Amino acid sequence: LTLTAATTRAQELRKQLNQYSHEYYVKDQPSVEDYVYDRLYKELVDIETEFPDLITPDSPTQRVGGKVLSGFEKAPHDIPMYSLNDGFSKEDIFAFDERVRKAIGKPVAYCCELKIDGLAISLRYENGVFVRGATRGDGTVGENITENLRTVRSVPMRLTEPISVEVRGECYMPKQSFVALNEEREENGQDIFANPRNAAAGSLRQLDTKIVAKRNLNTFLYTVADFGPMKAKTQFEALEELSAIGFRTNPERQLCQSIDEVWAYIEEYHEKRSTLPYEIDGIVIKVNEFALQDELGFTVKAPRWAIAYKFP
Ligand SMILES: CC(C)(C)c1nc(N2CCN(c3ncccn3)CC2)c2cc(C(N)=O)c(N)nc2n1
Numbered sequence: 568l569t570l571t572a573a574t575t576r577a578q579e580l581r582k583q584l585n586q587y588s589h590e591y592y593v594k595d596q597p598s599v600e601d602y603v604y605d606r607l608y609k610e611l612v613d614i615e616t617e618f619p620d621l622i623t624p625d626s627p628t629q630r631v632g633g634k635v636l637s638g639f640e641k642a643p644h645d646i647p648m649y650s651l652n653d654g655f656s657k658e659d660i661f662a663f664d665e666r667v668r669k670a671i672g673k674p675v676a677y678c679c680e681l682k683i684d685g686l687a688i689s690l691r692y693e694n695g696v697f698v699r700g701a702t703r704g705d706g707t708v709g710e711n712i713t714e715n716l717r718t719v720r721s722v723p724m725r726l727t728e729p730i731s732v733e734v735r736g737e738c739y740m741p742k743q744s745f746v747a748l749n750e751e752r753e754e755n756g757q758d759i760f761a762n763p764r765n766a767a768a769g770s771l772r773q774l775d776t777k778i779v780a781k782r783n784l785n786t787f788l789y790t791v792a793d794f795g796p797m798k799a800k801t802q803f804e805a806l807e808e809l810s811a812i813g814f815r816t817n818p819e820r821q822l823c824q825s826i827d828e829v830w831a832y833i834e835e836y837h838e839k840r841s842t843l844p845y846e847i848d849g850i851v852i853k854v855n856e857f858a859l860q861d862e863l864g865f866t867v868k869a870p871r872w873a874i875a876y877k878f879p
């Protein structure tokens with residue numbers, strides 16, 4: 568296989584393998600059987616081994632990691648990563664809804680999402696290419712964990728469209744991976760992780776990307792910070808649009824027209840809670856219309872258009 572034949576074949580394989588990987592990791596719905604992916608994967612690895620100069624950032628062989636950093640660099644957030652006000656009872660929720668109605672002057676629809684137990688991260692894309700990944704940190708400055716995020720399978724290295732955007736989401740570790748990880752630590756005489764959140768956070772502080780690639784972390788994107796060319800005028804639309812451009816979003820989302828539908832939603836998943844492959848510790852209620860979120864604005868620490876109902 569010449570260099571010219573390999574240069575061309577590599578792009579075809581990356582193109583196809585990344586599509587398969589998208590259906591598998593992002594949609595949780597693989598089209599082909601693993602052995603189909605494996606052969607093609609092995610074929611690209613042969614080509615990459617023959618011509619290491621054909622290796623690209625979006626090549627699926629990169630998910631295994633390799634870089635070891637001396638430490639993390641500061642990662643300023645152009646747009647703040649605010650906190651969330653909390654509600655602990657049915658009353659707190661209706662109390663919040665009344666304040667929202669008092670400020671807006673009419674009933675408002677809420678986009679409801681599960682409060683994923685993990686670590687909030689920000690992703691930056693230039694012309695569809697993944698260029699930066701950062702932890703939330705203190706809200707205005709986090710850590711630059713770009714190299715580690717490259718190993719998180721559901722994080723696209725190249726979007727379905729060459730657009731430039733900044734999105735924020737939750738990076739977590741599924742219950743079963745959490746369980747196996749602790750057994751592994753127990754076997755090695757290490758201290759186990761108290762919960763999945765700590766397992767995720769601790770994994771993302773790891774400097775050896777080879778290790779982080781094995782931590783089996785996943786993601787759920789919940790917001791667009793810098794829209795770029797994106798349309799979306801409501802949170803519900805933002806979530807569908809995050810999915811359209813190639814991000815992993817949470818299927819359990821729901822748009823509720825009333826505060827009563829929101830409570831029914833809370834109760835619904837309050838039961839289903841234990842049946843999810845990941846831990847949640849509540850529900851995040853968001854004023855759907857961006858025009859309305861803008862009206863409500865933010866307090867000094869959190870938006871006045873959202874509240875997180877924390878489970879008891
Ligand atoms: C965009 C806004 C600001 C409304 C927002 N902020 C969130 N969080 C704030 C507190 N952040 C935080 N992280 C660590 C320590 C303290 N606060 C972690 C992100 C959200 C968290 C989740 C989730 N957990 O599934 C979610 N579906 N939507 C969110 N939406």
Ligand SMILES: NC(=O)c1ccc[n+]([C@@H]2O[C@H](COP(=O)(O)O)[C@@H](O)[C@H]2O)c1
Pocket residue numbers: 587588590591592597598599600601602604605608627630720
């Ligand atoms: N059927 C598919 O489309 C698909 C896509 C990506 C990974 N996989 C599987 O995931 C596992 C890990 O593979 P990678 O290390 O290449 O990510 C393998 O067992 C592989 O077969 C299957």
